[model samples]
Target: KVFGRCELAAAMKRHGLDNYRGYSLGNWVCAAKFESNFNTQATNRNTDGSTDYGILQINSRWWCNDGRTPGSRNLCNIPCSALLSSDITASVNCAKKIVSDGNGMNAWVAWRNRCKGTDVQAWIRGCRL
Candidate 1:
């Protein structure tokens, strides 16, 4: 029985996330647990004629858009859900790129601070590549 949360944990682990006990996965799980409860199939209709989907609530238009093609709304192009369909390493690597590129996990750390009320800078400090 492959649970999505466990699968996501495995994905995180593949990207050198063995320190999952105190890192972005904690932030991710905190966010997912509250926002969508780790529901990968979750979807929310947006007011701008688009939709947010999956556990991470990825905006399809932003991460995946084939210019109105059929089934283009699918998240296949986005690596977020790739954990379920393909290589967990690839998924975690993609997440590392996005997280590191955007705010270097500081944003996630801040989110953790706000959401989980934990001083997670140590966890942030642990992130590497």
Candidate 2:
């Protein structure tokens, strides 16, 4: 599913990203823009052979069990395929786990480069979330 900007905001808010772990809803929304461009089917393979899955680009090595990532911990206890589903419930929950695990929003390099230390209010400027 390819979500529009405001649509993504609403969905993320509904899934509990609002002020999650001290990060604002715009932080999550901004990261998603750069991480996957609001596309639910997005996936990227890392240099270590671990794959990133879904909207938040959850990693296969530590989060989801893709059965392909070497030494995958599957810490989120979800299959990687679940992250690619149109329904983003699993992806949002996994992302929450990631931030809750002490990585914060820095877990995603894209967020660090594109969304960090920036005025991300523009990300949700017109959204009613």
Candidate 3:
């Protein structure tokens, strides 16, 4: 489940995130690093009583549902646990869905809080693709 920068980039490309929403791979890479530190099992229960899932820390309120969460809406049509898997295809797809939902890359607080205006070059410096 661990990933080097290049490995993560390649995997993301294969999963169809290569140039999504005009976002370069480094953008996603930095978001991933800040979101969950590349940990698939990452989950955070926020102060608002919503839980964030997987590497992107997708919130359960609108995306996936954990059953215990009160108001998920289950927008992604996948269980919350599905996002915690090593396969990660579901997670990527859902993340893209979020992007397509008009948030652009702003869907992630990590991107807004840290990645924006930062140098994306260093994120993919050693990454071949």
Candidate 4:
């Protein structure tokens, strides 16, 4: 698999993320950091019969599909493998849609538990979007 630039903060800037969904850029950085440590090829099998895909660790329940993630809704219209790519355009688009429903970054549990609390600035230190 190809390695990612893992440029969380820079990417947010390039994508014009500009704190989309009303969250701070720092918060977004932390969320991504906690989700997949910025790895594009990351995937995680969840205990809930779902799998997390990509740098955002987006859940199979509402996003991309892997075929093996039983009962997944696959709302992103993307294959799970696409999310694992370093390009990130699709993953970013999916994440935007997932938050447009008003859930924001809370859409990812990693953001809620690990990356929440103003204690997460370090992830954006050098990256600084």
Candidates sorted by lDDT, best first:
2, 3, 4, 1
**Going through the candidates in order, what is the number of backbone clashes in each?**
0, 0, 0, 0
Q: Which model is ahead, 2 or 3, in terms of lDDT?
A: 2
Candidate 4 C-alpha lDDT tens digits along 1-129? 333233667777677665787776677777777788788888888888888888888888778887877666888899878888878787888888887867777778778987777666565665534
Note the residue pairs that clash in candidate 3: none
Please state the error at residue 87 of candidate 2 in Å.
1.0
Q: Each candidate: what lDDT?
A: 0.47, 0.92, 0.86, 0.76
Model 2: residues with Cα > 4 Å off, grouped in runs: none
Q: How well does candidate 1 score on lDDT at residue 63? A: 54
Q: In candidate 2, residue 21 scores what lDDT?
A: 92
Candidate 4, superposed: residue stretches over 4 Å from native: 1-6, 119-122, 126-129
Q: Is candidate 1 or candidate 4 better by TM-score?
A: 4
TM-scores, all models, native as reference: 0.51, 0.97, 0.94, 0.84
lDDT of 2 by residue, 28-115 (tens): 9899999999999999999999999999999998999988987779989999999999898999999989998877999989999999
Spell out the clash pairs found in candidate 1: none
Give the local distance difference test score of model 3.
0.86
Candidate 3's C-alpha runs over 4 A off are none
Model 1 lDDT per residue over 10-126, tens place: 455556754433455556644544444565555566666565545544444545452443344433455334433334443344444445545544433325445555653333344
Please give, for residues 3-116, the per-residue lDDT of candidate 3 as tens digits: 667777777888988779888888888888899888889899988788999888888899998887775588999999998998879899999999999979898988899997
lDDT of 1: 0.47
Colliding residue pairs in candidate 2: none
